[PDB]
Design an enzyme around this catalytic site. Structure first.
Site, PDB file in Angstrom:
ATOM      1  N   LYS A 163       0.838  -1.198   0.000  1.00  0.00           N
ATOM      2  CA  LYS A 163       0.000   0.000   0.000  1.00  0.00           C
ATOM      3  C   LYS A 163       0.876   1.252   0.000  1.00  0.00           C
ATOM      4  CE  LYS A 163      -3.176   2.742   2.808  1.00  0.00           C
ATOM      5  NZ  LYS A 163      -3.763   2.932   4.163  1.00  0.00           N
TER       6      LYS A 163
ATOM      7  N   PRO B  98      -0.560   9.819  -0.194  1.00  0.00           N
ATOM      8  CA  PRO B  98       0.558   8.892  -0.016  1.00  0.00           C
ATOM      9  C   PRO B  98       1.299   9.155   1.303  1.00  0.00           C
ATOM     10  CG  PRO B  98       0.962  10.459  -1.820  1.00  0.00           C
ATOM     11  CD  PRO B  98      -0.164  11.003  -0.957  1.00  0.00           C
TER      12      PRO B  98
END
Ligand code: K
Length: 528
Positions: free
Chosen positions: A78, A110
């Site tokens: 991820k 992110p």
């Protein structure tokens, strides 16, 4: 000897077995640990997402290598949460719509800290150029090379396992829990009692002295950890601590989930969690090898179980009568106090928000960490309990406000749900932060470098949602500063230095997109 001698943990799953394994290490064999866990009816594994500190703060503390645990829970990589269709009206679709301005309706959140020039984060140089028309780039693509890597579905490591970027994990929670139970029972001498709880026995001060199980056996102890889930069998029922409902901040209260087989060879594997906006909430997508977990989070005040189940099925083209679904009603909010007397709540028994930013496992690890540091003796010093409670409430209320901002600053007005979000009141601390942001100033500037930040848990815990995170959500949703940071108007040399940083992000992205393996190929190597 005024010391705790026995800790009894009520409930298994990730919360109980994380608590057991961690205290097993922290208490260095001086305390007996017992887990009371009913035998579980298996659920379909609907997937769980995490944050990057998990390996350093938890598995490395226990001496468990990344590869070892990932291989046992079909784990995947991820690099962000990716938000789809949060600004545009219509039915749930996995495909992004187009904004009025021509941009695709997607933005990323992110990991990793933004670089600085002249002590100003790169966010602010981007905002200046965007507000002045000198760039048409989005925040996420200008400031993080991860965006380009994720757009090409490349992995965050090379095939030799050299690191290229920051990342966290996707996994099957029920397998991680089984892996940790095995670890705690065989390597740390935790006793597993497979039974249900029927009574909670208390002394003249209301301190718990023991639990009785359905078979009649009595488990004595000095400290009790409530990992019983939303029921809060110790903290709410036995100790009578009130739960503070926070549905005046967040509206979603339900989910419907399944796991969907997936052709990894045809489509590749996305190295990120998707949050797909729906008419009455949103839907998660958590890729693993061979499948993705998915779940529609919704408010039952704006959609019925059947409506939600149909809209969720239509997303992925599932047949709603020939599909296995889990349905959950949840509690949103936290206990008034997480720790009362000699009962400490951890996990869902303590507090909960929807998994919009993958906060669930983080809240567990943080509570356990703080319990080990505030660990009591049998006198239960009230200041120790108070300080623990104060950390839990600030952590929760901070993340609650961050989540509310995702909804409050959505421009969507196409359904009663999306409009209802805008009639809720923003909390004061987040109003203050919005005002700061709107004047061009940073919000919660990172204190330290990225090594120290993901290295020392206290550093991350004290600055969990940094400037970069507020930019990702506010800019993503289309809320901009009123003007650039005025100091930038006096700093032509700093402007030019930031140009080099923007060029570095582009170069790193272009280079890594050419040379990295696909996520699919790295998973195929990892899972052997
Ligand atoms: K006791």
């Amino acid at each position: 000897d005024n010391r705790i001698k026995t800790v009894v943990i009520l409930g298994g799953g990730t919360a109980g077995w994380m608590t057991a394994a961690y205290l097993g290490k922290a208490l260095q064999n001086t305390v007996k640990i017992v887990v009371l866990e009913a035998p579980t009816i298996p659920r379909i594994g609907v997937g769980e997402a995490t944050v990057p500190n998990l390996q350093r703060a938890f598995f490395d503390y226990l001496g468990i290598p990344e590869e070892e645990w990932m291989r046992e829970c079909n784990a995947s990589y991820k690099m962000a949460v990716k938000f789809i269709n949060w600004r545009t009206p219509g039915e749930g679709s996995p495909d992004p719509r187009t904004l009025d301005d021509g941009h695709t309706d997607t933005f990323h959140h992110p990991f990793g800290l933004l670089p600085s020039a002249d002590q100003i984060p790169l966010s602010h140089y981007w905002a200046a150029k965007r507000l002045q028309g000198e760039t048409d780039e989005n925040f996420d693509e200008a400031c993080f090379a991860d965006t380009a890597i994720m757009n090409a579905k490349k992995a965050p490591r090379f095939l030799d396992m050299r690191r290229a970027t920051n990342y966290a994990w996707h996994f099957d929670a029920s397998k991680v829990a089984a892996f940790l139970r095995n670890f705690a029972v065989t390597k740390q001498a935790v006793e597993h009692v497979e039974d249900e709880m029927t009574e909670v026995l208390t002394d003249e001060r209301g301190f718990i002295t023991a639990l009785r199980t359905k078979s009649g056996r009595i488990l004595q102890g000095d400290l009790f950890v409530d990992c019983s889930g939303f029921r809060g069998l110790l903290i709410n029922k036995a100790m009578e601590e009130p739960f503070i409902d926070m549905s005046d901040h967040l509206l979603c209260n339900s989910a419907v989930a399944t796991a969907v087989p997936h052709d990894d060879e045809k489509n590749g594997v996305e190295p990120y969690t998707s949050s797909i906006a729906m008419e009455a909430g949103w839907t998660w997508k958590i890729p693993m090898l061979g499948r993705f977990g998915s779940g529609h989070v919704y408010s039952d005040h704006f959609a019925t179980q059947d409506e939600a189940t149909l809209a969720f099925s239509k997303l992925w083209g599932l047949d709603p009568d020939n599909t296995e679904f889990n349905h959950v009603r949840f509690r949103v909010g936290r206990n008034r106090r997480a720790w009362v007397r000699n009962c400490v709540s951890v996990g869902l028994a303590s507090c909960f928000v929807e998994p919009l930013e993958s906060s669930g496992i983080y809240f567990i690890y943080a509570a356990i960490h703080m319990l080990a540091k505030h660990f009591p003796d049998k006198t239960f010093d009230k200041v120790l309990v108070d300080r623990f409670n104060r950390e839990i409430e600030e952590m929760f209320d901070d993340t609650r406000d961050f989540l509310q901002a995702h909804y409050y600053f959505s421009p969507r007005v196409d359904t009663p749900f999306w409009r209802a979000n805008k009639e809720l009141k923003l909390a004061d601390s987040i109003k203050d932060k919005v005002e700061t942001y709107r004047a061009g100033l940073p919000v919660n500037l990172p204190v330290t470098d990225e090594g120290t930040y993901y290295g020392n848990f206290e550093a991350e815990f004290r600055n969990f949602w940094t400037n970069g995170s507020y930019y990702c959500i506010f800019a993503g949703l289309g809320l901009m500063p009123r003007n650039p940071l005025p100091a930038l108007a006096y700093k032509p040399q700093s402007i030019a230095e930031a140009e080099l940083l923007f060029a570095d992000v582009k170069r790193k992205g272009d280079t890594l997109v050419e040379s990295l393996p696909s996520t699919y190929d790295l998973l195929r190597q990892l899972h052997g």
